[PDB]
Design a protein around this ligand. Structure first.
Ligand SMILES: Cc1cc2nc3c(=O)[nH]c(=O)nc-3n(C[C@H](O)[C@H](O)[C@H](O)COP(=O)(O)OP(=O)(O)OC[C@H]3O[C@@H](n4cnc5c(N)ncnc54)[C@H](O)[C@@H]3O)c2cc1C
Ligand SMILES: *[C@@H]1O[C@H](CO)[C@@H](O[C@@H]2O[C@H](CO)[C@@H](O[C@@H]3O[C@H](CO)[C@@H](O)[C@H](O)[C@@H]3O)[C@H](O)[C@H]2NC(C)=O)[C@H](O)[C@H]1NC(C)=O
Ligand SMILES: *[C@@H]1O[C@H](CO)[C@@H](O)[C@H](O)[C@H]1NC(C)=O
Ligand SMILES: *[C@@H]1O[C@H](CO)[C@@H](O)[C@H](O)[C@H]1NC(C)=O
Ligand SMILES: *[C@@H]1O[C@H](CO)[C@@H](O)[C@H](O)[C@H]1NC(C)=O
Ligand SMILES: *[C@@H]1O[C@H](CO)[C@@H](O)[C@H](O)[C@H]1NC(C)=O
Ligand SMILES: *[C@H]1O[C@H](CO)[C@@H](O)[C@H](O)[C@H]1NC(C)=O
Length: 578
């Protein structure tokens, strides 16, 4: 089986040459490996810190076991710095194994708002990265299944024109075999009373209102992790090699006259037991948004003011690790009556005005006058160029005011409770990730999302979370509401927005959607990679993973990342062919 084909001994690759080295066997990494090795003459080696996990059992394969794997060997559990919002560290869950985070994520399959992806081209000047182009790759990746009658009756709606049916990633309705809970339709009824839409297909380009959605699972409910979808079918390809249990530490650079060229990588598990492997064409970094930037820095690609004091020679000076954008999540949970019994998930993609309610006008005044916020974020080291950050913020203001994009997500789980996980989708805060040591294998790094260090992010989160409590005992939801359990006794039930702002910093987690740490945007705008994911000033080196999106999106990110891996893989093959 696949297990027998996987490499584990570094001596099997040490000193060898392949066409492409892919650092990180995760979502983008394995999608890209699969596409590249469709040409039998192209050799690819994937190097993954973890191993194969796709047949472990329910802890991986059943989406309804979500969270059980946290804290195990399959979770990197990256620790943040001591956060300034609450003086505590946080854990950033991240998958460790073939498939990366797809091994451990919630399986939620949705797309952004059209205007968001269009702005990657029209504001961030990435030629060809508009909604229609990226969406065509997204459709190609997708192998969706329409809902059956019982799934529709629960609240599903599937637009056949918005889903590929002949692709690679199996997606369709989560269906545990229970009857579906009426709470999903009650939430829809409760928001309909407020004028909010329901059942819009979150894959069509306007994610707003309360809808169900597809999940990344096979018809038999087995998790569609990236290794099961893109590696397991293809691992017999002799030109596709996978080494497990080793970390990529740094990219090996040589001089090609005036410009450094990536010629390979060093890998290993501790200082003093490292090895080299070489790439004839390119090194492609796909270790995740917390890690790919650090790999550049360890290699001498990063900010001279960060690298020089650590004792690293800055070969290429770029703002690597800046522009980190993760969301904050909080919970509101209630007990339900026995008539609320059954399975189902749904989500409210809530607009700015839906989020703030009566605070909308004041929130808009801040949005109109404070974009000061850019100066503050820069001063905190989340970004280097105040003008370019302001442009990002004007872009979010355009999204909110001229496109009415969703600004928060209130994610409903049922299956015996009514529980919301709630996050502000569009944080203005900008954080960073930087190495704190020269030795890659020590994994000593500062990951600072700067949660709640922008006032609008704290107000918006507070307002969204308060809204979750509000809707839980509104309209049709009153049918099933059997008293709040979280915050419950920890926060008075009539708490106002001010009280919620005081509560939230002590009751949130990372959302685990960190993007931006090797931003795909022009160099003068603060970018690290061009519109073909190439690191500025280096030949044969790309960063291709969730490091690269320059903005957040009103979406779950898998649909975007599979699409982007396909789009970049074609760019790479175009270059190989020429
Ligand atoms: C808890 C959680 C829940 C989520 N829920 C959802 C959801 O419901 N819907 C959705 O669309 N998305 C969701 N996501 C997001 C999605 O899973 C990630 O954004 C996506 O997998 C990132 O893809 P990537 O290729 O950038 O990185 P990853 O998939 O994280 O892959 C990176 C790979 O690199 C490996 N690695 C790390 N360091 C090294 C090294 N130095 N050298 C070699 N290999 C290395 C890792 O072990 C990993 O396999 C969730 C993520 C998490 C953590
Ligand atoms: C996280 O911990 C730090 C301490 O490491 C807290 O910062 C400190 O907060 C206190 C207030 O609780 C500040 O004290 C104040 O000093 C000013 C003078 O600058 C004085 O005018 C006040 O009357 C008061 O004594 C202190 O300066 C500040 N910084 C440090 C280095 O101690 C921080 O507030 C904690 N954060 C959270 C979210 O709890
Ligand atoms: C279905 O998708 C098509 C093509 O995207 C879209 O134009 C039409 O509005 C959609 N209809 C609904 C009800 O989502
Ligand atoms: C949102 O709220 C403001 C009032 O604060 C109003 O000016 C505006 O038109 C509303 N926007 C939308 C899209 O309804
Ligand atoms: C929800 O919000 C409205 C404001 O229109 C308020 O009147 C109502 O009591 C709130 N309900 C709950 C359960 O908090
Ligand atoms: C800062 O950002 C602006 C806006 O993108 C850009 O015009 C300018 O060149 C940038 N400054 C630097 C030093 O690159
Ligand atoms: C330098 O050498 C590379 C070898 O990787 C060659 O293909 C390329 O044309 C050269 N170009 C520059 C700009 O240095």
């Amino acid at each position: 089986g696949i297990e027998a084909s996987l490499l584990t001994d570094p001596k099997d690759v040490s000193g060898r040459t392949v066409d492409y080295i892919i650092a990180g066997g995760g979502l983008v990494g394995l999608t890209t490996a699969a596409k590249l090795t469709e040409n039998p003459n192209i050799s690819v080696l994937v190097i993954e810190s973890g191993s194969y996990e796709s047949d472990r059992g329910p802890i991986i394969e059943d989406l309804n076991a979500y969270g059980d794997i946290f804290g195990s060997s399959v979770d990197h559990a990256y620790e943040t710095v001591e956060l300034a919002t609450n003086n505590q560290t946080a854990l950033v869950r991240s998958g460790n194994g073939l498939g990366g985070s797809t091994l451990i994520n919630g399986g939620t399959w949705t797309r952004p708002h059209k205007a968001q992806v269009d702005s990657w081209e029209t504001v961030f000047g990435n030629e060809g990265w508009n909604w229609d182009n990226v969406a065509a790759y997204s459709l190609q990746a997708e192998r969706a299944r329409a809902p059956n009658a019982k799934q529709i009756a629960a609240g599903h709606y599937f637009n056949t024109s918005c889903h590929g049916v002949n692709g690679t990633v199996h997606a369709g309705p989560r269906d545990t075999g229970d009857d579906y809970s009426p709470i999903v339709k009650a939430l829809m009824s409760a928001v309909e009373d407020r004028g909010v839409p329901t059942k819009k297909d979150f894959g069509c380009g306007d994610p707003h209102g309360v809808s169900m959605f597809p999940n990344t699972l096979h018809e038999d409910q087995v998790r569609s992790d990236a290794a099961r979808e893109w590696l397991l079918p293809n691992y017999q390809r002799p030109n596709l090699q996978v080494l497990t249990g080793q970390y990529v530490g740094k990219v090996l650079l040589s001089q090609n006259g005036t410009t450094p060229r990536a010629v390979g990588v060093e890998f290993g598990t501790h200082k003093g037991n490292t090895h080299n492997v070489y790439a004839k064409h390119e090194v492609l970094l796909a270790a995740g948004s917390a890690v790919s930037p650090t790999i550049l820095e360890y290699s001498g690609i990063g900010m001279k003011s960060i690298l020089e004091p650590l004792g690293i020679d800055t070969v290429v000076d770029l703002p690597v690790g800046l522009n980190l954008q993760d969301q904050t999540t909080a919970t509101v949970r209630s007990r339900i009556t026995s008539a609320g019994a059954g399975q189902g998930q749904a989500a409210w993609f809530a607009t700015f005005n839906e989020t703030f309610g009566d605070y909308s006008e004041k929130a808009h005044e801040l949005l109109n006058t404070k974009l000061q916020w850019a100066e503050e974020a820069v001063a905190r080291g989340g970004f280097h160029n105040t003008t370019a950050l302001l442009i990002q913020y004007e872009n979010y203001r355009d999204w909110i005011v001229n496109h009415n994009v969703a600004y928060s997500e209130l994610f409903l789980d049922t299956a015996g409770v009514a529980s919301f996980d709630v996050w502000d989708l569009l944080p203005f805060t900008r954080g960073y990730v930087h190495i704190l040591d020269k030795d890659p294998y020590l994994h000593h790094f500062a990951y600072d999302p700067q949660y709640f260090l922008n006032e609008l992010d704290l107000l918006g989160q507070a307002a969204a979370t308060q809204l979750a409590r509000n809707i839980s005992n509104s309209g049709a939801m009153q049918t099933y509401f059997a008293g709040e359990t979280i915050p419950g006794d920890n926060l008075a039930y009539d708490a106002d927005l001010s009280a919620w702002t005081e509560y939230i910093p002590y009751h949130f987690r990372p959302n685990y959607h960190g993007v931006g740490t090797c931003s795909m945007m022009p160099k003068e705008m603060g970018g690290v990679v061009d519109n073909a994911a190439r690191v500025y000033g280096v030949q044969g080196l790309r960063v291709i993973d969730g490091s690269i999106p320059p903005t957040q999106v009103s979406s779950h990110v898998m649909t975007v990342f599979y699409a982007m891996a396909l789009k970049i893989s074609d760019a790479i093959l175009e270059d190989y062919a020429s």
